[PDB]
Amino acid sequence: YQPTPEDRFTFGLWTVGWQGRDPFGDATRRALDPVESVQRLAELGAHGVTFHDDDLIPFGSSDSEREEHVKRFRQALDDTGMKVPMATTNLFTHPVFKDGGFTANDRDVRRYALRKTIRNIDLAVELGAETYVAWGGREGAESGGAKDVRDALDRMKEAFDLLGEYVTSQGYDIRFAIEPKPNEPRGDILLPTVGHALAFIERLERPELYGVNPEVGHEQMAGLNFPHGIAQALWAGKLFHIDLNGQNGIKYDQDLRFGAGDLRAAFWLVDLLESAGYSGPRHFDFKPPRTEDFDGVWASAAGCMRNYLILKERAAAFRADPEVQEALRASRLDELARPTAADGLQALLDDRSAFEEFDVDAAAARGMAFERLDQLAMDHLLGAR
Amino acid sequence: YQPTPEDRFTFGLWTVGWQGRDPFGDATRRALDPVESVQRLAELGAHGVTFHDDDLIPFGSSDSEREEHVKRFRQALDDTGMKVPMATTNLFTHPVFKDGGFTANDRDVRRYALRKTIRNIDLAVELGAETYVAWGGREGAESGGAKDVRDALDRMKEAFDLLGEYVTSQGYDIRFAIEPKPNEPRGDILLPTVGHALAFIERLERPELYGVNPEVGHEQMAGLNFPHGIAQALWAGKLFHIDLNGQNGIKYDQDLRFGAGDLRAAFWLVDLLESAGYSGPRHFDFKPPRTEDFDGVWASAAGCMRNYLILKERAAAFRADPEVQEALRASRLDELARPTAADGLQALLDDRSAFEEFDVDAAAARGMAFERLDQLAMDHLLGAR
Amino acid sequence: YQPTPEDRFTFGLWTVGWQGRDPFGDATRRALDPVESVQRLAELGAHGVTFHDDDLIPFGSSDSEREEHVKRFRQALDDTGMKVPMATTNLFTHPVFKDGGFTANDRDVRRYALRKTIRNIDLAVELGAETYVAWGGREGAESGGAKDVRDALDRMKEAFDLLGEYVTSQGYDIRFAIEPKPNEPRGDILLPTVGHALAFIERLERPELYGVNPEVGHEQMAGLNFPHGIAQALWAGKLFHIDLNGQNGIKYDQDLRFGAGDLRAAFWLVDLLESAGYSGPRHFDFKPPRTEDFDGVWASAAGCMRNYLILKERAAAFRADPEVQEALRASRLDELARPTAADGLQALLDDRSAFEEFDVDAAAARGMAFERLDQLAMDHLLGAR
Amino acid sequence: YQPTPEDRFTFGLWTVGWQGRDPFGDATRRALDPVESVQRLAELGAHGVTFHDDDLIPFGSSDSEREEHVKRFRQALDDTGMKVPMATTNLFTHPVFKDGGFTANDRDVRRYALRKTIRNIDLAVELGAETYVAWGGREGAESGGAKDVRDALDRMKEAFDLLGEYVTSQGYDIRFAIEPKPNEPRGDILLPTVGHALAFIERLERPELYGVNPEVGHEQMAGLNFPHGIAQALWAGKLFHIDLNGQNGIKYDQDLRFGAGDLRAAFWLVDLLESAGYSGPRHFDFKPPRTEDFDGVWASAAGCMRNYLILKERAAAFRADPEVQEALRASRLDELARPTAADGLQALLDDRSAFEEFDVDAAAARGMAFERLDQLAMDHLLGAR
Ligand SMILES: OC[C@@H](O)[C@H](O)[C@@H](O)CO
Ligand SMILES: OC[C@@H](O)[C@H](O)[C@@H](O)CO
Ligand SMILES: OC[C@@H](O)[C@H](O)[C@@H](O)CO
Ligand SMILES: OC[C@@H](O)[C@H](O)[C@@H](O)CO
Ligand SMILES: [Mn+2]
Ligand SMILES: [Mn+2]
Ligand SMILES: [Mn+2]
Ligand SMILES: [Mn+2]
Ligand SMILES: [Mn+2]
Ligand SMILES: [Mn+2]
Ligand SMILES: [Mn+2]
Ligand SMILES: [Mn+2]
């Protein structure tokens, strides 16, 4: 279960770099130099790193200081062979974003948020990023009167359309991935789930430029089934990127290492990504708990990749098992793949066996055999075969 | 606060007709004759009634018995002037639907579910229904292996496309409204939220035929902001119908009368529907608690319309108050309506005031004045002005 | 992983006997004869069975019919060596209990609830039950005015005190176990958690007669940590019985087979029961999903026992691993067991190393090493060591 | 609705003084001087203020600086007539407490936690505090192996017993109030609910010295019914203090102003405190949202007190209404207060009308009339009577 670059495991600078400051507590760790993170991550077998503008270049830096920061980072990439597959903008930390970036009530803040984004897009492309992530963490409200949501969606569409116009006029080979979250740090966040984000994208001027970047813990904060949501994104052809972590249900955003939280959902998720042949980064957006020192930081990070690899092996074994293949036929998963009425509407309407002469009682008596299947899946996950 | 037919208040036969059978308990009330419900509802000031096939015609009825049931009901409509604005199919009660209607693993069940739906569509149109609701209550799973979700979405799209082909080939003036629910009676239900349903509709062959029928308590079972979700549906032009009830957070589906549960969310919801000029039915999909006798049934039903009317008056007063108008300007809701960059991308890129010369500290120091606004909204809701 | 009688696995008659009626659906399975369940359960290697009075004796049976039902049951126990370690009363199904048993607003219903309970205590004692469970599933409210909770707690105390007096006056060797549940089928149920039940017991006339019967899925419906609550019950000396099943989050009460739902919590629960040396029944209060025929019913039951046995093995291997023992020392689990100030208050007050000369920064910098420890537990759970 | 000192409204220094740092954002407001808060709060009509040691005396101040801070504070209290009814210890902010105070795995940290607490008790007594609050916000875990909960409860008992010994040996008139919270900032916090805290107190050496300090939003984070939990605390004689604020569901800890969040629960809570005659402080532990400047801060604080006062009026009118009194009799609230069997066990056993001749069907048919009662409460709350 040794990770290698071929596994496409990526990490945000802000993940292993999180200092442990929470709503009730001061930082428990010193800041990590981005170049140190790059080197340590390369050693652990990571494919690449990702960043917010403000992770790499401290807010407010002069152009002189900005250029120095990028140069040191780029040297560390050159030395290690680490990739930068994705980047994103910090539109949530600075007090100016307290009511949003793209959907701030103040017009001047919205124009500022766009300019800050455009600037980092240029940098992302230059570094080789294929995906530009937007998490509108401050877009939303604590109170019902504070935000007219139809106007806010107009402003959100406007911002993303402008971003698409920018990218296409520059000739950039980069796509956008919108990251939904139901709440935190706002009471309610706009585009709260994968479904909301998918629906929103279809109203943009160029929908082909936009996908979703779903996060395990985000969807689980609404008590939603994360693999079901991923399946929908894949069904729509919009899974551009994914953020992997752990979450123990409906509560604050925990950002546990991948594999922690809902272990069975992690198993079904890996099963789905591997069998759908998802070929994007497996990005870990997580925080080593503030109880940990730096040794614990790197153990937590190693743990994320390790659990992914154990889960992949178990899922592959589950699908390869002919007893599982037999169980799947017994539960009629094969019949689910068959069209309901490839014979067409008229044939269906005239088919007496579909209704007039359908035996409802015989069909209702058929067991689904789902519990036996699920126990085979349990046995495999636990390696108790 | 007397309801009249002009208020467009509707009720399902299954609402006031619910006998009080829950997962742990037997029925506490005798069954209500549909004709008695129609007459009692007319007396309370209702605009109309809605039905599942199986509410009006008991499952399994011969064509002879079916025709008798429809005749008695139609006579009661003729006598009262009550409308039937909406109908729907029961694809969840009979054991044959234990694994779904449209996305059952068994192909024969899927064809049956389509034929049962088509038959009731004919009846709905004949009675004057404008909206046909689909709640896929059994579409989903308790276990991860039981349902390949991409295949299930293929089957769900296939069923709805066939329904659209049927309706258009008959020349019917009826639209479909898909009703999302996150869970219950399945562990997870397909198209769990308003967002998921909106995104799904955009992949149908004729998206113009399909909208959403969101329910207050459904969205609140995922801890989502129901008014935000409605605003999105309205923004997309897809709010075809709405189900109103009450829910006390994330737990089982409670179906309290409208106004109970989250009272402040009810206020914001009524504010939004009235100010967006929603002109569809205000349908109450609720259950009088099984503690109640028939007198309590009709009091609960009256209560639904009464709370809507009190909330409408309070919301109207809130918006009419020039002190509220002043508070809205102070929180820059007016600036939210202004385009971010009607000057265009190039002008934005060249605008030094948007970035190079933007004063971030002055803009960050501006208070949003949201708490004062929210207290004005509280004062109005409570009539403490 | 074969269960044998010495593993102390027990099942309610109502568990494998659930016909699959939910709030949205009719029964999918025919009724089981109690004697068939006993025999089938004995064949799977169960230790014993439990029952509500109404599972064994249909409601309102004459004394003559009552006798015939008990006779047939007793014979099946005689033939198999199956034990009856626990019994309980159904005070929730019949419409008369729609507002509660012990805490119904109507005094005549409360007396009847007590008499119905007392009758089944005699029977339970005769059959060999050591624990008498009480789940007050109807005690509570949907609305704030319906139940004065101080008065209701007086009535609840009164009922349990009367039951205590009854048992001690008969010289019965039977203890009560109160089963808490946050909600469903009432909007909120009284004594919603393990904590509320523990606190309540301390105010009864004979606290020594009463403990708790916590259920995995009940506490998880409040998003609480089930192993933590079980630890508190053990700490207090009050874990008289336990109900085991699975639950996926804060939602309706799912009753999945044990091991499904929150798998990691199930691991930590088995670890705790086994290391504390709990010696009571391992009772499965679950429902085979209504998708299943009878084969699926027995597959699901066997799965409960299998998952307990696998987790038991993995928890044992975890605790036995010298490398885990090393990690436990590294994380100072051993120091948690040493008294904070066995030297006393005066000694603590005079100890300068405790405050005045305490090096806060040196102690703050120590890593807890919790992540490495947790990954070892993960590796053991998955058999990846 | 003007608050005056006799209404007993109090505020923590940390509430109006919150600078607006959350997990995703920097501070949006400058620090408040404690003396400015005292004065501004006195002007709004507050009764008193509360503090953590670290709110008043910056962490690690010399004894000389400590004295100067207390002196300035005491003078502001002297100038205004502001009381200090409660005080508490910060055992959560400093990195040293990252694994807890009283239940840290490191014994030296636990001793330091006790000494830090004892120092502030002396100060609290000197200032006139009658209640000493303890919120064990760091006591808990993110992972199952990190904390043996039985040992942790031993350490928690040990600490509270030492504090009890200290207070009684000094002859102080001060009582402890334990503040439960389900999660945040730890994954799960020990003593997660009002119930767990009540139960724990019964195992302390001097139970009479300890009660609870429940918070609206804490219990609501577990989806529990806050007025029910407060009723249980009152029933037990343990409601020593209360924290009032608002919370919208199971999610992160929001700390909205009181009256926001679950409005109906706030009505039922005010009804309960006022009719039980609670005479302790009405303490607001809330945070003005970080969107607000200082004007918004004081608007939000005034809003807390205003909403309490409006709800108090509506609850009083509700109880005083003869029509509500009639509805309470119709619903048998008065019968709930009569003992179930003051005639005794033997009399109940011999009473044939209690079982043998009890007409279950006649009692089952009685409606509870709860819906009509609840609509009257709704009408009163909204001023629609
Ligand atoms: O909750 C935070 C979001 O998960 C993440 O994408 C990073 O924070 C991205 O900006
Ligand atoms: O949860 C049930 C759904 O709310 C309702 O639309 C009716 O039940 C429609 O079939
Ligand atoms: O839902 C019921 C509770 O889980 C247990 O009491 C058993 O079911 C016995 O009544
Ligand atoms: O979140 C903290 C708790 O709500 C209360 O203790 C106060 O904040 C005092 O510590
Ligand atoms: Mn993320
Ligand atoms: Mn994250
Ligand atoms: Mn509905
Ligand atoms: Mn409903
Ligand atoms: Mn139950
Ligand atoms: Mn149970
Ligand atoms: Mn708190
Ligand atoms: Mn508090």
PDB file of all heavy atoms in Angstrom, chain A residues 208-224:
ATOM      1  N   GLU A 208     -20.057  24.040 -20.975  1.00  0.00           N
ATOM      2  CA  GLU A 208     -18.972  23.071 -21.208  1.00  0.00           C
ATOM      3  C   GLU A 208     -17.672  23.390 -20.451  1.00  0.00           C
ATOM      4  O   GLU A 208     -16.842  22.507 -20.224  1.00  0.00           O
ATOM      5  CB  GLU A 208     -18.710  22.898 -22.720  1.00  0.00           C
ATOM      6  CG  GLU A 208     -17.995  24.082 -23.397  1.00  0.00           C
ATOM      7  CD  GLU A 208     -18.954  25.204 -23.894  1.00  0.00           C
ATOM      8  OE1 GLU A 208     -20.187  25.175 -23.623  1.00  0.00           O
ATOM      9  OE2 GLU A 208     -18.437  26.134 -24.571  1.00  0.00           O
ATOM     10  N   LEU A 209     -17.502  24.642 -20.050  1.00  0.00           N
ATOM     11  CA  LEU A 209     -16.348  25.040 -19.247  1.00  0.00           C
ATOM     12  C   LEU A 209     -16.422  24.734 -17.735  1.00  0.00           C
ATOM     13  O   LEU A 209     -15.419  24.853 -17.037  1.00  0.00           O
ATOM     14  CB  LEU A 209     -16.086  26.531 -19.417  1.00  0.00           C
ATOM     15  CG  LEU A 209     -15.728  26.977 -20.826  1.00  0.00           C
ATOM     16  CD1 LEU A 209     -15.512  28.500 -20.807  1.00  0.00           C
ATOM     17  CD2 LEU A 209     -14.468  26.219 -21.293  1.00  0.00           C
ATOM     18  N   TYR A 210     -17.586  24.330 -17.238  1.00  0.00           N
ATOM     19  CA  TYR A 210     -17.792  24.233 -15.781  1.00  0.00           C
ATOM     20  C   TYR A 210     -18.198  22.854 -15.354  1.00  0.00           C
ATOM     21  O   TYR A 210     -19.044  22.242 -16.004  1.00  0.00           O
ATOM     22  CB  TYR A 210     -18.858  25.234 -15.297  1.00  0.00           C
ATOM     23  CG  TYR A 210     -18.607  26.608 -15.816  1.00  0.00           C
ATOM     24  CD1 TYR A 210     -19.032  26.951 -17.088  1.00  0.00           C
ATOM     25  CD2 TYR A 210     -17.927  27.560 -15.056  1.00  0.00           C
ATOM     26  CE1 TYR A 210     -18.788  28.203 -17.613  1.00  0.00           C
ATOM     27  CE2 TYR A 210     -17.659  28.849 -15.590  1.00  0.00           C
ATOM     28  CZ  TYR A 210     -18.096  29.135 -16.870  1.00  0.00           C
ATOM     29  OH  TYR A 210     -17.920  30.356 -17.447  1.00  0.00           O
ATOM     30  N   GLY A 211     -17.609  22.390 -14.245  1.00  0.00           N
ATOM     31  CA  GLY A 211     -17.976  21.108 -13.627  1.00  0.00           C
ATOM     32  C   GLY A 211     -18.093  21.355 -12.130  1.00  0.00           C
ATOM     33  O   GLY A 211     -18.162  22.519 -11.681  1.00  0.00           O
ATOM     34  N   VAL A 212     -18.104  20.263 -11.369  1.00  0.00           N
ATOM     35  CA  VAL A 212     -18.203  20.341  -9.924  1.00  0.00           C
ATOM     36  C   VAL A 212     -16.958  19.766  -9.299  1.00  0.00           C
ATOM     37  O   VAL A 212     -16.249  18.958  -9.911  1.00  0.00           O
ATOM     38  CB  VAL A 212     -19.481  19.649  -9.346  1.00  0.00           C
ATOM     39  CG1 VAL A 212     -20.746  20.477  -9.698  1.00  0.00           C
ATOM     40  CG2 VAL A 212     -19.637  18.196  -9.846  1.00  0.00           C
ATOM     41  N   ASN A 213     -16.648  20.272  -8.112  1.00  0.00           N
ATOM     42  CA  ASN A 213     -15.608  19.692  -7.296  1.00  0.00           C
ATOM     43  C   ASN A 213     -16.272  19.340  -5.984  1.00  0.00           C
ATOM     44  O   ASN A 213     -16.206  20.115  -5.042  1.00  0.00           O
ATOM     45  CB  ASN A 213     -14.433  20.687  -7.082  1.00  0.00           C
ATOM     46  CG  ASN A 213     -13.357  20.117  -6.168  1.00  0.00           C
ATOM     47  OD1 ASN A 213     -12.955  18.972  -6.329  1.00  0.00           O
ATOM     48  ND2 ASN A 213     -12.925  20.888  -5.182  1.00  0.00           N
ATOM     49  N   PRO A 214     -16.913  18.169  -5.908  1.00  0.00           N
ATOM     50  CA  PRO A 214     -17.574  17.743  -4.660  1.00  0.00           C
ATOM     51  C   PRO A 214     -16.571  17.331  -3.578  1.00  0.00           C
ATOM     52  O   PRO A 214     -15.505  16.779  -3.879  1.00  0.00           O
ATOM     53  CB  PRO A 214     -18.340  16.489  -5.096  1.00  0.00           C
ATOM     54  CG  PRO A 214     -18.383  16.596  -6.642  1.00  0.00           C
ATOM     55  CD  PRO A 214     -17.063  17.139  -6.949  1.00  0.00           C
ATOM     56  N   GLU A 215     -16.951  17.552  -2.329  1.00  0.00           N
ATOM     57  CA  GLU A 215     -16.123  17.160  -1.188  1.00  0.00           C
ATOM     58  C   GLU A 215     -16.950  16.203  -0.307  1.00  0.00           C
ATOM     59  O   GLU A 215     -18.088  16.528   0.025  1.00  0.00           O
ATOM     60  CB  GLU A 215     -15.678  18.411  -0.383  1.00  0.00           C
ATOM     61  CG  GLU A 215     -15.045  18.059   0.946  1.00  0.00           C
ATOM     62  CD  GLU A 215     -14.121  19.146   1.483  1.00  0.00           C
ATOM     63  OE1 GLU A 215     -13.299  19.664   0.726  1.00  0.00           O
ATOM     64  OE2 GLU A 215     -14.228  19.471   2.663  1.00  0.00           O
ATOM     65  N   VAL A 216     -16.344  15.079   0.110  1.00  0.00           N
ATOM     66  CA  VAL A 216     -16.992  14.080   0.977  1.00  0.00           C
ATOM     67  C   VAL A 216     -17.731  14.721   2.153  1.00  0.00           C
ATOM     68  O   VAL A 216     -18.951  14.573   2.297  1.00  0.00           O
ATOM     69  CB  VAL A 216     -15.971  12.996   1.508  1.00  0.00           C
ATOM     70  CG1 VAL A 216     -16.649  12.051   2.505  1.00  0.00           C
ATOM     71  CG2 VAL A 216     -15.269  12.229   0.333  1.00  0.00           C
ATOM     72  N   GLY A 217     -16.984  15.436   2.986  1.00  0.00           N
ATOM     73  CA  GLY A 217     -17.542  16.065   4.189  1.00  0.00           C
ATOM     74  C   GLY A 217     -18.609  17.141   3.952  1.00  0.00           C
ATOM     75  O   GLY A 217     -19.518  17.257   4.753  1.00  0.00           O
ATOM     76  N   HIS A 218     -18.502  17.921   2.865  1.00  0.00           N
ATOM     77  CA  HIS A 218     -19.570  18.886   2.468  1.00  0.00           C
ATOM     78  C   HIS A 218     -20.925  18.239   2.275  1.00  0.00           C
ATOM     79  O   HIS A 218     -21.912  18.686   2.881  1.00  0.00           O
ATOM     80  CB  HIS A 218     -19.210  19.687   1.203  1.00  0.00           C
ATOM     81  CG  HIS A 218     -18.023  20.567   1.374  1.00  0.00           C
ATOM     82  ND1 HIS A 218     -17.626  21.472   0.417  1.00  0.00           N
ATOM     83  CD2 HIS A 218     -17.144  20.693   2.399  1.00  0.00           C
ATOM     84  CE1 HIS A 218     -16.545  22.106   0.840  1.00  0.00           C
ATOM     85  NE2 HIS A 218     -16.235  21.653   2.039  1.00  0.00           N
ATOM     86  N   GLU A 219     -20.994  17.195   1.442  1.00  0.00           N
ATOM     87  CA  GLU A 219     -22.283  16.542   1.209  1.00  0.00           C
ATOM     88  C   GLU A 219     -22.794  15.828   2.441  1.00  0.00           C
ATOM     89  O   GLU A 219     -23.999  15.779   2.678  1.00  0.00           O
ATOM     90  CB  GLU A 219     -22.240  15.537   0.040  1.00  0.00           C
ATOM     91  CG  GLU A 219     -21.835  16.109  -1.281  1.00  0.00           C
ATOM     92  CD  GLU A 219     -22.763  17.194  -1.866  1.00  0.00           C
ATOM     93  OE1 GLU A 219     -23.954  17.000  -2.112  1.00  0.00           O
ATOM     94  OE2 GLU A 219     -22.240  18.248  -2.187  1.00  0.00           O
ATOM     95  N   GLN A 220     -21.884  15.245   3.214  1.00  0.00           N
ATOM     96  CA  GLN A 220     -22.306  14.529   4.426  1.00  0.00           C
ATOM     97  C   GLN A 220     -22.834  15.467   5.552  1.00  0.00           C
ATOM     98  O   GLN A 220     -23.564  15.023   6.427  1.00  0.00           O
ATOM     99  CB  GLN A 220     -21.182  13.587   4.895  1.00  0.00           C
ATOM    100  CG  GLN A 220     -20.874  12.495   3.861  1.00  0.00           C
ATOM    101  CD  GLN A 220     -19.704  11.597   4.249  1.00  0.00           C
ATOM    102  OE1 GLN A 220     -18.919  11.913   5.160  1.00  0.00           O
ATOM    103  NE2 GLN A 220     -19.577  10.458   3.552  1.00  0.00           N
ATOM    104  N   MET A 221     -22.497  16.752   5.475  1.00  0.00           N
ATOM    105  CA  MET A 221     -23.023  17.809   6.375  1.00  0.00           C
ATOM    106  C   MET A 221     -24.505  18.120   6.142  1.00  0.00           C
ATOM    107  O   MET A 221     -25.135  18.747   6.977  1.00  0.00           O
ATOM    108  CB  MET A 221     -22.234  19.122   6.213  1.00  0.00           C
ATOM    109  CG  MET A 221     -20.849  19.166   6.843  1.00  0.00           C
ATOM    110  SD  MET A 221     -19.959  20.638   6.237  1.00  0.00           S
ATOM    111  CE  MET A 221     -20.597  21.786   7.454  1.00  0.00           C
ATOM    112  N   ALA A 222     -25.035  17.728   4.975  1.00  0.00           N
ATOM    113  CA  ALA A 222     -26.473  17.717   4.723  1.00  0.00           C
ATOM    114  C   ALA A 222     -27.079  16.310   4.875  1.00  0.00           C
ATOM    115  O   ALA A 222     -28.209  16.085   4.468  1.00  0.00           O
ATOM    116  CB  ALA A 222     -26.794  18.291   3.320  1.00  0.00           C
ATOM    117  N   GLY A 223     -26.302  15.367   5.406  1.00  0.00           N
ATOM    118  CA  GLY A 223     -26.751  13.973   5.553  1.00  0.00           C
ATOM    119  C   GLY A 223     -26.988  13.278   4.223  1.00  0.00           C
ATOM    120  O   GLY A 223     -27.714  12.291   4.176  1.00  0.00           O
ATOM    121  N   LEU A 224     -26.363  13.766   3.141  1.00  0.00           N
ATOM    122  CA  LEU A 224     -26.578  13.171   1.822  1.00  0.00           C
ATOM    123  C   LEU A 224     -25.610  11.995   1.573  1.00  0.00           C
ATOM    124  O   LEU A 224     -24.557  11.912   2.215  1.00  0.00           O
ATOM    125  CB  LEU A 224     -26.454  14.252   0.712  1.00  0.00           C
ATOM    126  CG  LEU A 224     -27.555  15.332   0.765  1.00  0.00           C
ATOM    127  CD1 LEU A 224     -27.331  16.414  -0.311  1.00  0.00           C
ATOM    128  CD2 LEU A 224     -28.984  14.741   0.646  1.00  0.00           C
TER     129      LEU A 224
END
